[PDB]
Write a structure and sequence with these properties.
Chain lengths: ~220, ~220
């Protein structure tokens, strides 16, 4: 088991480093978007394949942390590039969704409630961070709104996916508290950029009503 | 597998008939609540155990239908009895949840759209039907409201749980249309019932909210 996890971690690190170098190299154009999408998918699938074989907490915890760092680094690299707004949005949204998926896949095995809450809070924090960087770059209101929409829906899906498996109010409190904070962070940041006010009210309203449903649902756990 | 399904169906029929007779016999008090609560879990667990074993889609579909019929039959039996309001509500509410769970377990093994739609639409229909009878004889507003609220959430958990396994807009339409009908039926019956406006407002508000999130999330596929 330890050797298998070591192979997973080593190859993930190596492939991530090579992709980082390549992303640095290429000078311009939509080939950047193509490469970003390809690398995101490759690392996501490769990391997910390892989860099927682990059987212990630290191995799972390290696997999740490594993957989260890798995908963060890739999108961070694309941030430096000049790229079209729509391609940037699709890239970062596509990257985030893959982090959500692997986050959910790993959580399915963690029997220790404390670790389950910890791994949860981490991913909710991580996905929130990425959306902040994209919001610092989007060139148009419609692009920013669409990313904001996906931010609420994905974080909700990750939040509930945790609540199903949590079982004791120590986890229930923290997952509720973290979800509230993350929702506020996204909404507060998104409100700062230039966008049509009516669309902004809609986005903020949707953000507000999701936290209510989460809180209503968590209370019934 | 056919023989295993035969054993499952036969024993489910036997136990159902036996509890039907017993519930007919007894004539007083909280012993009725005890009997119903114990009986519901017994049939559910036996169904869940059988569902673990493989089957052809139709065999699975029959298994789900049989269980749904049984738990409805027991609930209908208790309806004829006098009971304390809280015990009656907790009985039929707690019974309904077990139909939800078995429906969730069954859907995990489906592999075709026809079964996914049929099983989904049926269970959302059935769970809605039971609440109709519970509300048909509720004693007081506060008890009626608390169970009426649960009617929204427990339909939602099944609705989205189906949504995430479906893969085609044709199936998506069935889930969307059924969810709208179920929400309206609950709202209409609760509106007809006698209850304070303050509670009736939140019940209507939750319906307005909860259909929208399904409308968004089921569309995002």
């Amino acid at each position: 088991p330890e050797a298998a996890a070591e192979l997973a971690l080593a190859t993930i690190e190596a492939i991530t480093e090579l992709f980082v170098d390549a992303l640095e190299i290429i000078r311009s154009g939509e080939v950047a978007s193509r490469l970003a999408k390809s690398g995101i998918e490759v690392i996501a699938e490769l990391a997910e394949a390892a989860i099927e074989h682990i059987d212990d907490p630290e191995q799972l915890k390290k696997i999740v942390k490594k993957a989260a760092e890798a995908i963060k680094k890739i999108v961070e690299e694309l941030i430096k590039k000049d790229v079209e707004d729509e391609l940037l949005a699709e890239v970062t949204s596509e990257g985030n969704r893959k982090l959500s998926r692997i986050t959910s896949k790993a959580l399915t095995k963690i029997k220790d409630e404390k670790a389950a809450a910890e791994l949860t809070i981490e991913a909710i924090e991580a996905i929130t961070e990425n959306f902040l960087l994209a919001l610092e770059r989007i060139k148009d209101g419609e692009v920013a709104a669409k990313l904001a929409e996906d931010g609420l829906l994905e974080i909700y899906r990750l939040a509930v996916s945790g609540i199903e498996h949590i079982d004791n109010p120590e986890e229930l409190e923290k997952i509720v508290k973290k979800t509230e904070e993350a929702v506020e962070r996204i909404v507060e940041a998104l409100e700062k950029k230039d966008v049509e006010p009516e669309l902004k009210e809609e986005v903020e309203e949707l953000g507000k009503k999701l936290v209510e449903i989460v809180r209503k649902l968590a209370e019934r756990k």
